Paper text:
To obtain structural insights into the unique ligand-binding pocket of [name], the same T4 [name] (T4L) insertion construct as the one previously engineered to obtain [name]/risperidone complex structure was used. We eventually obtained the crystal structure of the [name]/haloperidol complex at a resolution of 3.1 Å. Comparison of the [name]/haloperidol and [name]/risperidone crystal structures reveals an overall 1.5–2 Å binding pocket compaction with an outward shift of the extracellular tip of TM1 and an inward shift of the extracellular tip of TM2. The volume of EBP in the haloperidol-bound structure is significantly reduced when compared to that of the risperidone-bound structure. This is likely due to the more compact positions of TM2 and TM7 around the ligand in the haloperidol-bound [name] structure, and the inward rotation of EBP key residues: Glu952.65 and Tyr4087.35. Notably, the conserved residue Trp100EL1 in [name]/haloperidol structure rotates outward away from the binding pocket as compared to the risperidone-bound structure. The outward rotation of Trp100EL1 in the haloperidol complex allows the formation of a SEBP, which is occupied by the chlorobenzene moiety of haloperidol. This rearranged [name] SEBP consists of residues from TM2, TM3, EL1, and EL2 and is defined by Trp100EL1 and Phe1103.28. The mutation of Phe1103.28 to Ala or Leu on [name] greatly enhanced the binding of haloperidol or L-741626 (15.33 or 1.77-fold for haloperidol and 144.18 or 18.65-fold for L-741626), while the mutation of Phe1103.28 to Trp or Tyr greatly reduced the binding of haloperidol and L-741626 (28.00 or 41.41-fold for haloperidol and 8.51 or 57.54-fold for L-741626). The ligand in [name] is located deeper in the OBP and embeds in the deep binding pocket defined by the side chains of TM3, TM5, and TM6, which accommodates the butyrophenone moiety of haloperidol and benzisoxazole moiety of risperidone.
Dopamine receptors belong to the GPCR superfamily and are divided into two subfamilies on the basis of sequence similarity and pharmacological profiles. In contrast, D2-like receptors ([name], DRD3, and DRD4) activate Gαi/o proteins to diminish cAMP levels as well as modulate certain ion channels. [name] is arguably one of the most well-established drug targets in neurology and psychiatry. For instance, most receptor-based antiparkinsonian drugs work via stimulating the [name], whereas all FDA approved antipsychotics are well-known [name] antagonists or partial agonists.
Residue numbers in the entry: 35 to 139, 144 to 382, 387 to 463
Write the structure that this text describes.
Amino acid sequence: NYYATLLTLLIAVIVFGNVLVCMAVSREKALQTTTNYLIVSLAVADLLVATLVMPWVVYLEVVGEWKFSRIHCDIFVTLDVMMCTASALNLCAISIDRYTAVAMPTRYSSKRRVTVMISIVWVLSFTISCPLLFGLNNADQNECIIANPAFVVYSSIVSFYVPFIVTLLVYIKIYIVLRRRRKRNIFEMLRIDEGLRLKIYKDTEGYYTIGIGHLLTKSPSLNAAKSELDKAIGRNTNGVITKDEAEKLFNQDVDAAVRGILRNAKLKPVYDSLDAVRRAALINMVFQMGETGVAGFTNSLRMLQQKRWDEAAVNLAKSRWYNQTPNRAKRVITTFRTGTWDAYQKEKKATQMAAIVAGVFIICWLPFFITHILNIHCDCNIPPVLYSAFTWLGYVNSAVNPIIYTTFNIEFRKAFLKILH
Ligand SMILES: O=C(CCCN1CCC(O)(c2ccc(Cl)cc2)CC1)c1ccc(F)cc1
Ligand SMILES: CCCCCCCC/C=C\CCCCCCCC(=O)O
Ligand SMILES: CCCCCCCC/C=C\CCCCCCCC(=O)O
Ligand SMILES: CCCCCCCC/C=C\CCCCCCCC(=O)O
Ligand SMILES: CCCCCCCC/C=C\CCCCCCCC(=O)O
């Protein structure tokens, strides 16, 4: 009916979005990065689906059954599985290239490496698909490989779940790595402002503290003050701590500071509103003056919530807080405006996009392999009317990816507008 015309334009927008991505990467040196090279390899898998495969899927909707040779169906199924597996194996290499960038310290060596990855993606995609042409070691095929009971079991495990687990395990490791550095930079930030002390010392208000504003005990008794420290370290403090031990002590101070921020009605919303780095600045304030003290200049706090970065910085400089510790105030206020650690970077934003495509990829195809589980779980025969929608939802992912590139990235965005105009 009229539904055939929607899909052919879906094929057209898949080609529209991806042909842009390929040229845009090779057009500008600023987008010629390891990850973006792996991204065009993903774009080529999304193009070959739209050109080699999706046309036969639309005829199958139009006509309503195969109505072509058995071997044509084998080729069509083999190639359909092959290009979707390239899509998955490309996400896997993208995540791995994101692991290396955040976790490892690279000119000609990057091009020679990415090359090796891309070569693995397609060769393996192919070698995984070759069984479908030779009837999954089942001779007298006598039928399109789709009809083999093992087909859904082979294609689901080998081409989806197993690449899905690995890519997910990498992203977890990436999250852990970024989490250690984010906590590393906080400690490093307050080491610069408060100062790191490794011998027990009387603080401003008289009580004995150590490291970065960690009071051992409100009660002043030196041997008793050692006492609380000894509980913390486990070794005989003897009033002596390592940088490391202080940091371990520091991350505890941060975690306590944060629960109080969320338990504070004046600071819960604004903390929730801010980004990771800007949150480290707000932590710096609570460390310096206390949540009740930071909870003041609500007037200034509204601006940080309203994303008014420039106007919050103008209003913060007006304070007494600036007058007492101007250098520290200016440093922190930059981090509030800049939202970066320049006062005291590139790949954390880029790695957020990588996971974002790997996530919408999964949600786009997830229901398709869900339904296939239900039939294998012998559940009430799943209506085909839905079964077809889930196929296209999976194929829709080919058109969403170039939309995500331009959405969450300025460089693809600018490279795109240059080609059109
Ligand atoms: O493999 C797939 C999804 C099935 C594609 N493909 C849809 C059409 C199909 O359902 C079909 C139906 C009827 C006929 Cl006749 C031929 C083919 C065969 C399977 C895949 C998806 C995501 C991924 F990360 C890895 C692999
Ligand atoms: C081919 C399918 C691959 C499936 C991959 C699934 C990935 C899901 C997304 C993210 C979960 C882990 C967090 C990723 C790190 C993000 C960095 C950060 O914001 O700290
Ligand atoms: C079935 C899941 C397997 C996932 C594989 C996905 C493809 C990309 C992954 C790995 C290739 C890594 C090659 C790196 C070579 C480095 C050589 C060098 O340092 O020059
Ligand atoms: C089932 C998953 C198996 C593969 C895991 C994928 C993640 C990491 C992949 C491989 C490790 C890459 C190491 C490259 C070694 C090159 C050494 C060299 O030549 O200097
Ligand atoms: C058994 C499941 C396997 C899961 C492995 C994936 C989890 C680890 C995360 C990423 C590994 C990336 C390694 C890339 C390093 C390249 C340099 C080198 O290997 O010498």
